Each structure stands twice: as C-alpha cells, then as structure tokens.
C-alpha cells in the first residue's frame, strides 16, 4: 500500500518539484528510485526510521526528507532536464523485499515554448473488414503533442474498456530529426461487427495530456497548452 | 558490484519455454531476487533467495535457480502464458547491506501469440469527423510477420501490436500507417508482407 | 564440540538520549570481543590475547556493523513500545542472542536466534531452524511478519555460513 503524488508533473529547468510518498504499512525502510531506459532502476535516497536519511547511488541534484514513519519526500530545488524520468517510491520490512508505488512521471523542459496538446481523431471500421471477418476495429490517433506525456483510454457506453484494446507502447516522433519533435500515438479497439452496427453504442478515444499549469507565464497567441483531456468520438452505424 | 542481464529484449512463443539470465559479480553471496513489472505499474517481487535449496519455486510456474559456481540466478518457466508479457528485473543486495537493492537493467519479455486461423489484410479507415482523413490498417497477420519502417519520412507506421478479445477467445496482430500526402493509399506505403491478403 | 554466541543488548533512556547499546561475543563460553556505546570512542574491542592478531579492517568493519545495530535497536524499541501499549516515559531493554554450536566434525550442530524484551522471552527460533516460538500475541505479530518474509531462511544464511567459518578461524587462533 504505497502512494505517490503527483503521478504526473511537468516543470521547466530551474523549477522546484517535490515528490511525496506515503505508506500505511508499518515499514521502516523507504526508498526513492528513478527508472530510465538502459539504466533500469537506480537508487537516489533511502531511509530507515523517521528522521533517518541515507545516500543512494545517484543522490546529486536530489534532497530527501523522512518526516514520519509513513512519509518520504524527494526534493528537487533546481530541476535539470536530466532529471526527467519515472520516479518510483518503495517501502520494505525485510532485506531486499520491496513494495513499490505506481510511479510519478516527471518531465523537465528548457523552454515551455515547444509544448503542444494532442489532437485526437477516431477512424471507423472498414466495411470490407466487417464483411471479411465479422469484426470491426476503430483506430485512435493522438497527434502533434509535446512533451511525451499522455494517457490513452477507450470508452464504450460510459465504461472504460480494456478488452479488444491495443495502444502503442511508445509514442513515435513526427520529425525524428529534431531534438524537440512533437509526438504521435496510435491505438486500436476491436469489437464484434454486430456491436458496432448498433446505433445505440457510443465509442470514445480519450487522451489525457499533461502540460502547463494555470499559473504559468504564457506569452503567445497560441492556445495555452495547459493540462487537459482531449477526446474523439464515434457512434455505431448499421447502414 | 554489478548485476547483469544480457538480453534487453526477449521474444518467446506462447506455451514455449522461457529463460531470463542474470549473473551477479559480488564478493560474497548476496541475497537474490526477481521482480516483475507489468505495463504502467510499479515493480512486484516475484522471487527471493536468502539461503538453502538453490531452486526457489514460485506459485506462478516460475522458478529461479541460485548457482554459486556460475554466479547466476536465472529465471525459468516451462511454458509462458500470454499474461506473462512484462519487464523482468534481476536484483541483488550485498550481505552487509541487505536492505540496499541493486537492479539489473531489465529484460522486456514479449510473448507473441499463436494465431489459429490468420487472414492477413490491409483495410482502410475514414475519420468520424471528416472523411478526407484516412488510415491504413494491417491486421490478422501471423506473429512471425515483422513490420518495418518506411523511407519516405512523411508517412508514419507503428510497430506490431497485439489485442485480445477476451469474451471470444480471440487474439490479433495489427499495425497502422498514416500520412497527409496525396500520393498515398493503403498498400502504397506498406515490407516483407504476406503475399496473400485482402485489399 | 565448540560454540559461538553474541548477546546484543540495548536499554532505552527516557528523554532525547540514544539507547545504551552493548555487544558481547563468546567463544566456548569465553568473552572474546565487546562493544559499548558509552565508551568515549565506541569500537569493538578484543577481550582476549588471541583476538588482537586481527587486522584493523576487521575491527572497523564489525564496528560499523555495531553502528547499524544501534539504529536497529532504537527503531525496534519504539516498535515494541507500540505493540505493548506502554507509556513513552519508561525505560526498556531489548536483547538479541544468536549463534552456533559446531560439532567435533565441524558441522553446524545447532543454530540460535532469540529475542527478549524487558527480561522476558519475546520470540525464538526452534531447533528445526524453520519454526518460531512466540511468547505472547505481540510476539505472534512478529511471528506472522517473519513467516511471510522468510526470516528463518535469512538468519540461516548467517547461521550456516559465517557463524561456522568465523568460529573455526577463531579456534585456529587458540
């Protein structure tokens, strides 16, 4: 029972971030790790008992506080782009036996100027497929977003669905040349053709985007790329 | 001090035998661990070894074996389930510092499914809002079929993706291709494809 | 037919003072090493002629071990305070006795892993080295946790390994 907040956070270089971890187990060991591709999990700081701090492997640029048995905070006074990572919190009550949190995704930018919300489109089953297979697939496309900080989900008749769904594991770059390229993410939902041919059935691709906060200095004519949910929908048709 | 997993990415067939390899380099015998991470989740302890019988046997069909001579703690499963698709981490902690886990860089396990009756096809899909937009969908091709990237760099193609229709006992492969250029239709920007497909 | 024991004790002090921690080692019922936190320079010290033919790295290492142990005792005294619903103004003792009996052959005859609180037995490892005897319910909690964590396997890593080997290295010195 480990809880971390925020689960998502976007700041800029020089910013000040605090990640919070709470565990309602009676564990005395708590840990802050970071996960990156090609590096696995790397320990930053850890703690044994309230008030105790212990240097990890990558402590630089990080401060930590263990106020109580339950609370472990990871402090970031001068956010660097290098600190853009997935942060895990853990607690333990036996040597090596760790209970992990669900993760806190943190993105650090140099300039908020390149931040764009996604554009979401739903594409509807080819009738050819419906004829050939008796199954119907819808496709969702989230396009031109930056940074890579989104969550895609499918909703049928008000319910989030997981069956028949396949979202890309990793968003691709639209202009791979750039080091600040926008991203694109696809997904698929397959239902039986008869279910799609029912006009009473509603389908929706929902994309949660994480970007700026309200109290961020936006100086552009662009629609301010604030944190938001962008959706696209489709109704079943029989024809 | 080090923990090494040789293969960053591993693909196995459903029902086929799996081994994920892990060698550690420690001065004394450390405490050994396997952790598993399913998508968008934290790590979960899979297996632990402190001492005794070298073969630690998980209830989930997995078993890891401590080999002192080989300095290894390899993970094994006689027959993988599709739900075993995850990232696997080997982890050790020094004898004097048993509370300080060092991890391997991980091994991403992909369990490619076995499609009973494949009929590979490239369908075309219109947008719900404006029919001017279109996407091309490769689907129902068998697991071994590998989708490659284009050379046009104005067309985008996703990698293979597997979906499971639970209520019907049905699994399917798929890849998507899309672009905003006019000289582009389904089966125009799609490599190594099965010659037998519906268009 | 030789043996090795350690008695590590801590007595908590009321107020904001760290507990008094000691560690005493015995080879064949004879004290050979000792640590005391009340010493001006808390180190492990040889209490016997043959012990001082050990290098400085040894002493430093085991001394650090003693430090970590101080931490463990201060935390777990709090834990016990919680389990027994006791006022925080009191003074309490916690003791960890552990070790190994090694036969004429050189084999582990017996392992020992025992914990006592305020003089009374709290929890102890049974002769089979895989079962625990728990005095009260507070001890039953610990027994549950340790049974889920596989504490016996962990302690056995020491009992069956370093305990015997170090005991032998210590016998050679006699």
């Amino acid at each position: 029972a480990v809880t971390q907040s925020p689960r998502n956070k976007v700041t800029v270089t020089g910013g000040n971030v605090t990640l919070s971890c709470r565990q309602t187990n009676s564990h005395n060991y708590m840990y802050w790790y970071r996960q990156d591709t090609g590096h696995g999990l790397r320990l930053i700081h850890y703690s044994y008992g309230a008030g105790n701090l212990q240097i990890g492997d990558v402590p630089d640029g990080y401060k930590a506080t263990r106020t109580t048995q339950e609370d472990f905070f990871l402090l970031l006074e001068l956010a660097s782009p290098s600190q853009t990572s997935l942060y895990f919190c853990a607690s333990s009550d036996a040597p090596g036996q760790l209970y992990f949190g669900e993760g806190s995704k943190l993105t650090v930018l140099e300039d908020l100027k390149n931040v764009f919300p996604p554009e979401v489109a739903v594409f509807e089953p080819s009738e050819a497929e419906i004829s050939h297979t008796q199954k119907a697939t819808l496709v969702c496309l989230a396009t031109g977003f930056y940074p890579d900080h989104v969550e895609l989900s499918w909703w049928v008749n008000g319910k989030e669905v997981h069956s028949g769904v396949c979202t890309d594991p990793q968003p691709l770059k639209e202009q791979p040349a750039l080091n600040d390229s926008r991203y694109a993410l696809s997904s698929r939902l397959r239902v039986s053709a008869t279910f799609w041919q029912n006009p009473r059935n509603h389908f929706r691709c929902q994309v949660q985007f994480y970007g700026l906060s309200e109290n961020d200095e936006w100086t552009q004519d662009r629609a301010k790329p604030v944190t938001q949910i962008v959706s696209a929908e489709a109704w079943g048709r029989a024809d | 001090q080090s923990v090494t997993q040789p293969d960053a990415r591993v693909t196995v067939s459903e029902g086929a035998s799996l081994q994920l390899r892990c060698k550690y380099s420690y001065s004394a015998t450390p405490y050994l661990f396997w952790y598993v991470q399913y998508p968008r989740q934290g790590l979960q302890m899979l297996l632990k070894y402190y001492s005794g019988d070298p073969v630690v046997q998980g209830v989930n069909g997995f078993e890891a074996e401590f080999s002192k001579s080989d300095s290894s703690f390899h993970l094994r499963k006689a027959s993988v389930h599709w739900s075993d698709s995850a990232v696997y981490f080997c982890a050790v902690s020094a004898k004097g510092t048993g509370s300080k886990l060092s991890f391997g860089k991980g091994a991403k396990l992909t369990v490619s499914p076995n499609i009973q009756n494949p009929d590979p096809a490239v369908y075309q899909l219109r947008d719900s809002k404006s029919s001017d937009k279109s996407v091309c969908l490769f689907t129902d091709f068998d697991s071994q079929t590998n989708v490659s990237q284009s050379k046009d760099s104005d067309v985008y193609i996703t990698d293979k993706c597997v979906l499971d229709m639970r209520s019907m006992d049905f699994k399917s492969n798929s890849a998507v291709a899309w672009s905003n250029k006019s000289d582009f239709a389904c089966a125009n920007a799609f490599n190594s494809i099965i010659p037998e497909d519906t268009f | 037919p030789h043996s090795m024991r350690y008695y590590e004790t801590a007595t908590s002090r009321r107020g904001l003072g760290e507990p008094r921690y000691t560690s005493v080692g015995y080879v064949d019922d004879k004290e050979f090493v000792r640590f005391d936190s009340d010493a001006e320079n808390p180190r492990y010290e040889p209490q016997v002629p043959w012990m001082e033919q050990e290098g400085p790295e040894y002493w430093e290492r085991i001394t650090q071990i003693a430090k970590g142990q101080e931490q463990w005792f201060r935390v777990n005294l709090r834990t016990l305070l919680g389990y027994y619903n006791q006022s925080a103004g009191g003074t309490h003792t916690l003791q960890w006795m552990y070790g190994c009996d090694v036969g004429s052959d050189g084999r582990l005859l017996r392992g020992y892993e025992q914990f006592a609180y305020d003089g009374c037995d709290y929890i102890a490892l049974n002769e089979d080295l895989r079962t625990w005897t728990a005095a009260d319910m507070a001890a039953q909690i610990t027994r549950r946790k340790w049974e889920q964590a596989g504490a016996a396997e962990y302690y056995r890593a020491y009992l069956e390994g370093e305990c015997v080997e170090w005991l032998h290295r210590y016998l050679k010195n006699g």
Binding site: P95 | - | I62, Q69, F115
Partner: peptide
C-alpha cells in the same frame, strides 16, 4: 563476527 541486521519486529 557479528551477524547482519535482523528483520524489524
């Protein structure tokens, strides 16, 4: 030689 840290109670 002293043993590694016990598990917490």
């Amino acid at each position: 030689s002293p043993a590694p840290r016990p598990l917490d109670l």
